[PDB]
């Protein structure tokens, strides 16, 4: 039948991959609180009350992992928000002063209700003072303050210190009005673009997904920050699964995703008051005023049975990825304090948790059940004030002290690993998984493993048996 | 009975009955609303990221309108031109096409001929009414 | 003759002879001029707001065109299709409407089912073309 | 076969069969690409001129559509309505215009009677369509 | 400095074209200043008063 003629169509269901800018869309129930969150500022559009989801039945799409352009867009978003939220705050240039520093002598209740008995802040902070000018000729006073040892170093001239970052670059003090609380964000594409969401449970990095359903735009995402252990994440529905760009290639990181969360709950037991001093015209500067009452290291608690069972499950999952090799865990082998230490933010101040008793273990053959008691795990977690969250792209930021006892509780869902390239142990077989590492992006690819950006192409062509009726 | 992109996996024959539902959502979207509350509100990155979203919405949609304008099929979901298929682009019989050849992979098969079909259709429209302008 | 919005209060029938003047003024305006004289005039506060005006101008015209594009009579001022009334969106007769009720008040009465009117109208245009494809 | 704008100096009659070449390049250019490779590239002075470039492309193309929309010749290349031409704008005969005078000169020759004519077309379309409603 | 100068151009060496100027500006800590010397061309340097300054 040569009599066929072309017949264009409109709104045809055909798409193709592409890259497109995305706009924020925050929830109405959590916004308008006037806190002016750093991450999800007031500029986000109101989210749709009823996000939809249209199931697609006879569809196969070649998804990908570690190649999403969405992660770069949201990385740029977070960098820009962190930069802009700090510009209207005060600098700390007049803090490059030769601090005269001595130890601390604190008297309080000796028992201090020490349940953990981990230790005390003594011989870890350096009670420092520096001169301030005065009208009289050659007469100076002391403006005392308390600073942690991680923010002072000594160069020469024994009994004299200075800020660690006051010389390398410029540091600002974040205004207390802005809050670091991560508000959920919904990324939503402009009209004319669809977001594909794989609802398959046991979906690793890449590979076709035959259960994908198309939504207008993504669900909530948490912009939370961490280094060694993922926090506040979304549990994998199916089962504990392992993800990587290439398992045999040790260079790439390995991300553990759980299905049952483990609750982490720990606090600073110290007692502090925010003393204010005036430097420059109308630019107040805060400092750790005094400590009275409770003096104890910032412990951290993890339930022992849950953690050991989770490790047993994860090693069981890893076993089928390495046939005859025993799995062992070792503490981080070094690096800066951002890797060898757990890092997470808590209501405007940044912890640094040791996390070694969790990650020191071994699993030879799982032959028998190595029974144990109920136990409580304690992690001595240090605290830093001057923080440069990122290597050379983030602004040095000075977190102000927070008054009173501060407590944070969160869900642990993700674990970051890394392999070691043994050569001559062809029979003396074992595997070490040093935790930590990974860029800031890997903290975020754990949530963007379901979404692919496509572009609708609603113009289609196919032959029919119709011919246009020419008019006369 | 099908939502957005509902029948994108279905066969050729039954997919056509949901062309409208995938056509009403080419411009409407969340971008219609202004913001949660109207610093640099107009100069924040989302003050310009949102603006970049709006300009892509009209440009991407209106590009398709350009091709519909030339071919004479303006204001028609389904059109009917007069370009005879010469069987060179694809010689599958009509039964083999509309029975179980799904949409998403259909025009990828013809993907080497889009650059010429989008040109030969324009000529066909031009030649139709040049005869008409000297006939009335 | 009447100018812009020159018969917004006049009756239904007598306001059907002034449609052409308002259609013309839907994009024409003084915003076409870039600036009186072009530091950083691109990002000047008087410049960022002007750019917002131009984007809102086209999106407001495109919104109307898209709906009228789908209804099968793109490129006409007045237009009637083949969707009969169910006579429950407005149970009023003819002369009671076109003589003494006004445009502004009329919209409020029917503004309660438009989302069920625009959708049903589009389906009719699609339905007509489907019968045409299998006709010749 | 000609190139883009390749016959502007030719006679009008022999330049009436190459309009599709010009009409095919009103939006399809180079601006559609975002950037060569992605610190907030959206605010660089080089990157702030695409916004002026992109919105100028549509805002210049829409003006063409608006006039084509009202006249009833929307969705066509060479249309022709039924409004008389009383020769007061140009009284030259059929042959004296088409075959010898070029396009650019002709556009300049009546550039001062355009605004009257552009209003005549829309009114001719509107009152003609009023007959249709007053016909059935 | 060297005296051979590879005198093929034989136009002139750069004496009097630069000035050894040792100024005195503060270090990172604003309360301390140190003496640092630098070499500047004469086109970048002017004298207000008090020659030898
Ligand atoms: C906050 O403010 C306080 C006070 O303002 C700061 O403390 C001051 O620091 C400065 C340093 O910046 C000190 O100056 C030093 O004074 C020394 C004293 O020398 C004098 O005496 C000499 C002879 O006296 C001898 O006997 C006495 C005891 O009887 C000894 O102490 C002395 O060393 C001698 O053995 C005289 O000949 C001399 O002229 C002085 O009058 C100085 O010797 C010393 O000089 C050092 O540095 C010189 C370069 O600047 C160098 O040339 C010298 O060789 C030498 O190395 C220096 O000027 C103040 O004394 C001290 N005030 C006190 C202690 O009350 C404090 O540093 C500041 N905090 C900061 C900046 O963080
Ligand atoms: C992971 O998810 C967890 C649960 O969603 C997060 O825990 C919650 O985190 C938020 C964010 O900071 C906390 O909200 C704060 O709550 C305090 C409570 O103030 C109390 O005291 C004042 C003064 O007496 C009183 O007025 C209040 O009513 C309270 O009694 C507020 O003061 C803060 O402004 C802020 O709103 C939640 O408290 C906290 N949950 C619990 C149970 O503590 C967790 O933060 C997430 N992970 C990370 C890393 O953020
Ligand atoms: C800022 O000061 C710190 C310490 O006061 C410097 O870090 C040390 O620099 C010396 C060289 O002056 C090195 O020998 C040390 O190894 C450095 N410390 C460490 C832990 O590596 C830092 O270099 C200074 N930076 C600037 C820009 O002045
Ligand atoms: C999380 O995933 C693990 C898979 O590693 C699930 O472990 C399975 O648990 C069921 C019942 O507890 C056993 O019958 C299976 O044998 C386990 N899997 C393997 C490989 O042995 C675990 O159940 C999941 N968590 C939840 C809450 O379902
Ligand atoms: C998080 O941990 C803190 C401290 O371990 C818990 O606070 C204690 O709760 C017990 C139980 O009633 C009290 O007896 C203690 O007095 C509390 N501590 C203090 C300093 O008052 C807290 O309940 C834990 N929260 C969660 C959700 O686990
Ligand atoms: C740092 O050390 C100084 C000096 O020891 C402390 O100053 C003391 O402040 C208390 C507060 O009432 C006074 O009772 C003492 O008399 C002060 N000491 C002297 C020698 O007068 C300062 O409090 C310390 N800073 C801290 C602990 O944060
Ligand atoms: C740590 O482990 C579990 C939480 O899963 C708690 O022990 C459970 O206690 C309930 C009854 O209280 C029993 O039915 C479970 O069989 C127990 N499971 C295990 C693994 O022991 C225990 O209380 C937790 N401790 C804390 C401090 O949270
Ligand atoms: C995290 O905790 C572990 C457990 O104690 C620390 O390991 C010891 O660290 C001290 C000094 O930091 C050394 O003297 C010991 O030799 C280490 N091993 C043991 C078995 O005690 C580890 O150092 C802590 N992390 C950091 C960064 O100090
Ligand atoms: C995906 O393909 C299957 C093929 O079996 C479709 O199932 C058939 O669908 C047709 C038309 O809907 C029916 O006439 C058959 O009876 C169905 N057979 C079976 C075994 O299901 C299925 O409908 C396709 N997916 C979609 C969304 O249409
Ligand atoms: C430029 O204009 C002159 C003016 O006529 C054109 O000359 C004619 O060209 C056609 C082309 O085939 C010939 O058939 C005629 O014989 C030529 N002369 C006349 C008097 O018509 C010339 O072709 C034009 N050039 C272009 C490129 O259009
Ligand atoms: C840098 O330090 C030198 C050494 O002190 C300064 O030279 C003398 O400074 C004193 C302090 O005012 C003056 O009274 C002397 O007159 C200076 N010497 C001479 C020869 O003039 C020098 O002035 C300092 N740098 C600057 C820019 O003042
Ligand atoms: C401060 O404490 C350290 C470590 O305990 C000790 O070496 C030093 O001598 C102490 N100095 C003073 C002045 O107490
Ligand atoms: C602090 O801890 C040290 C060692 O753990 C102990 O000797 C001391 O008594 C504690 N208390 C004070 C006030 O230093
Ligand atoms: C993901 O899983 C599929 C099937 O289990 C497998 O073929 C593929 O290699 C996996 N991807 C990676 C990166 O391991
Ligand atoms: C497919 O996706 C849907 C989405 O809700 C899910 O409920 C279902 O379990 C998935 N698998 C199958 C076989 O339908
Ligand atoms: C803790 O700090 C607060 C700060 O105002 C103070 O009121 C309180 O007395 C301190 N001690 C305790 C046990 O709360
Ligand atoms: C299991 O984990 C807990 C964590 O507290 C630890 O105390 C215990 O020794 C572990 N048992 C074995 C056999 O590894
Ligand atoms: C371990 O080695 C044995 C030796 O033959 C082999 O049969 C087996 O497949 C290997 N892997 C596992 C998981 O046992
Ligand atoms: C901790 O790690 C060391 C590494 O040498 C290992 O020998 C030891 O068994 C682990 N566990 C404990 C409780 O020390
Ligand atoms: C741990 O288990 C042993 C087993 O007999 C028991 O004797 C001991 O008291 C237990 N310790 C705790 C703290 O439960
Ligand atoms: C944390 O995990 C528990 C389950 O153990 C869950 O009920 C709770 O909602 C989670 N919290 C958040 C903030 O997701
Ligand atoms: C059919 O048309 C295409 C247009 O791209 C052309 O390439 C091909 O040669 C034509 N075939 C025949 C048989 O005319
Ligand atoms: C029809 O198409 C098939 C595959 O494209 C090809 O093998 C066959 O030769 C074609 N038949 C004709 C007559 O062109
Ligand atoms: C009137 O319109 C409604 C939808 O708004 C429809 O459900 C109803 O069937 C219509 N009336 C009749 C008589 O069909
Ligand atoms: C038309 O409406 C007006 C009031 O708006 C009323 O006075 C007049 O009676 C109405 N005409 C009829 C025929 O009801
Ligand atoms: C056109 O009008 C001009 C002056 O209005 C006159 O000179 C000329 O002869 C006219 N030509 C024709 C063909 O009517
Ligand atoms: C053609 O136009 C030119 C001027 O453009 C004129 O000189 C010539 O007479 C005209 N010829 C005819 C036949 O109109
Ligand atoms: C149009 O305006 C110009 C401007 O002065 C004038 O010279 C001309 O005569 C007018 N008419 C025409 C046909 O150009
Ligand atoms: C011819 O049309 C023009 C429209 O521009 C009008 O001004 C003029 O009056 C008309 N002439 C006659 C005789 O109607
Ligand atoms: C080089 O410079 C010196 C001054 O340093 C000067 O005396 C001499 O004349 C210059 N020329 C030669 C050729 O040495």
Coordinates of N, CA and C in Angstrom, one line a residue, chain B residues 3-60:
Chain B
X3 N -2.4 8.5 33.5 CA -1.9 9.8 33.9 C -0.8 10.3 33.0
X4 N 0.0 11.1 33.5 CA 1.2 11.7 32.8 C 2.1 10.6 32.4
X5 N 2.4 10.5 31.1 CA 3.3 9.5 30.5 C 2.8 8.1 30.8
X6 N 1.5 7.9 31.0 CA 0.9 6.7 31.5 C 1.1 5.5 30.5
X7 N 0.8 5.8 29.2 CA 0.9 4.7 28.2 C 2.2 4.8 27.4
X8 N 3.2 5.4 27.9 CA 4.5 5.5 27.2 C 5.1 4.2 26.9
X9 N 4.7 3.1 27.6 CA 5.3 1.8 27.4 C 4.3 0.9 26.6
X10 N 3.1 1.4 26.4 CA 2.1 0.6 25.7 C 2.3 0.5 24.2
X11 N 1.6 -0.3 23.5 CA 1.8 -0.5 22.1 C 1.4 0.8 21.3
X12 N 1.7 0.8 20.0 CA 1.4 1.9 19.2 C -0.1 2.2 19.1
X13 N -0.9 1.2 18.9 CA -2.3 1.4 18.7 C -3.1 2.0 19.9
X14 N -2.8 1.5 21.1 CA -3.5 2.0 22.3 C -2.9 3.2 22.9
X15 N -1.7 3.6 22.4 CA -1.1 4.8 23.0 C -1.7 6.1 22.6
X16 N -2.2 6.1 21.3 CA -2.8 7.4 20.8 C -4.0 7.9 21.6
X17 N -4.7 7.1 22.3 CA -5.9 7.5 23.0 C -5.6 8.3 24.3
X18 N -4.3 8.6 24.5 CA -3.9 9.4 25.7 C -3.0 10.5 25.3
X19 N -3.1 11.1 24.1 CA -2.2 12.1 23.7 C -2.6 13.4 24.4
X20 N -3.8 13.7 24.7 CA -4.2 14.9 25.3 C -3.6 15.1 26.7
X21 N -3.7 14.0 27.5 CA -3.3 14.1 28.9 C -1.8 14.4 29.0
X22 N -1.0 14.1 28.0 CA 0.4 14.4 28.0 C 0.7 15.7 27.2
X23 N -0.4 16.4 26.8 CA -0.3 17.7 26.1 C -0.7 18.9 27.0
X24 N -1.6 18.7 28.0 CA -2.0 19.8 28.8 C -1.0 20.3 29.8
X25 N 0.1 19.5 29.9 CA 1.1 19.9 30.9 C 2.5 20.2 30.3
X26 N 2.4 21.1 29.3 CA 3.6 21.6 28.7 C 4.0 23.0 29.2
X27 N 3.1 23.7 29.8 CA 3.4 25.0 30.3 C 3.0 25.2 31.8
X28 N 1.9 24.6 32.2 CA 1.4 24.7 33.6 C 2.4 23.9 34.5
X29 N 2.6 24.5 35.7 CA 3.5 23.9 36.6 C 3.6 24.7 37.9
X30 N 4.5 24.3 38.8 CA 4.7 24.9 40.1 C 5.2 26.4 39.9
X31 N 5.8 26.7 38.8 CA 6.4 28.0 38.6 C 5.4 29.1 38.6
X32 N 4.1 28.8 38.5 CA 3.0 29.9 38.5 C 3.0 30.7 39.8
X33 N 3.2 30.0 40.9 CA 3.2 30.7 42.2 C 4.5 31.5 42.4
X34 N 4.4 32.6 43.2 CA 5.5 33.5 43.3 C 6.6 33.0 44.2
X35 N 6.3 32.8 45.5 CA 7.3 32.3 46.5 C 6.6 32.1 47.8
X36 N 7.3 31.5 48.8 CA 6.7 31.4 50.1 C 6.5 32.7 50.8
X37 N 7.5 33.7 50.6 CA 7.3 35.0 51.1 C 8.1 36.0 50.2
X38 N 7.5 36.9 49.5 CA 8.2 37.9 48.6 C 8.7 39.1 49.4
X39 N 20.4 38.9 52.4 CA 19.0 38.6 51.9 C 19.0 38.5 50.4
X40 N 18.8 39.6 49.7 CA 18.8 39.6 48.2 C 17.7 38.6 47.7
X41 N 16.4 38.9 48.0 CA 15.4 38.0 47.6 C 15.3 37.9 46.1
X42 N 15.4 39.0 45.4 CA 15.5 39.0 43.9 C 16.8 38.7 43.4
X43 N 17.9 38.6 44.2 CA 19.2 38.4 43.7 C 19.8 37.1 44.3
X44 N 19.1 36.4 45.1 CA 19.6 35.1 45.5 C 19.7 34.1 44.3
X45 N 20.5 33.1 44.5 CA 20.7 32.1 43.4 C 19.3 31.5 43.0
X46 N 18.4 31.2 43.9 CA 17.1 30.9 43.5 C 16.3 32.0 43.0
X47 N 16.7 33.3 43.2 CA 16.2 34.4 42.5 C 16.5 34.4 41.1
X48 N 17.6 33.8 40.7 CA 18.0 33.7 39.3 C 17.8 32.2 38.8
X49 N 17.9 31.2 39.6 CA 17.6 29.9 39.2 C 16.2 29.7 38.8
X50 N 15.3 30.3 39.6 CA 13.9 30.3 39.2 C 13.6 31.0 37.9
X51 N 14.3 32.2 37.7 CA 14.1 32.9 36.4 C 14.6 32.1 35.2
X52 N 15.7 31.3 35.4 CA 16.2 30.5 34.4 C 15.2 29.4 34.1
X53 N 14.5 28.9 35.1 CA 13.5 27.9 34.8 C 12.3 28.4 34.0
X54 N 11.8 29.6 34.3 CA 10.7 30.2 33.5 C 11.1 30.3 32.0
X55 N 12.2 30.9 31.7 CA 12.6 31.1 30.3 C 12.8 29.8 29.6
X56 N 13.2 28.8 30.2 CA 13.3 27.5 29.5 C 12.0 26.9 29.3
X57 N 11.0 27.2 30.1 CA 9.7 26.6 29.9 C 9.0 27.1 28.6
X58 N 9.0 28.4 28.4 CA 8.4 28.9 27.2 C 9.2 28.6 26.0
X59 N 10.6 28.7 26.1 CA 11.4 28.4 24.9 C 11.3 27.0 24.4
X60 N 11.3 26.0 25.3 CA 11.2 24.6 25.0 C 9.9 24.3 24.4

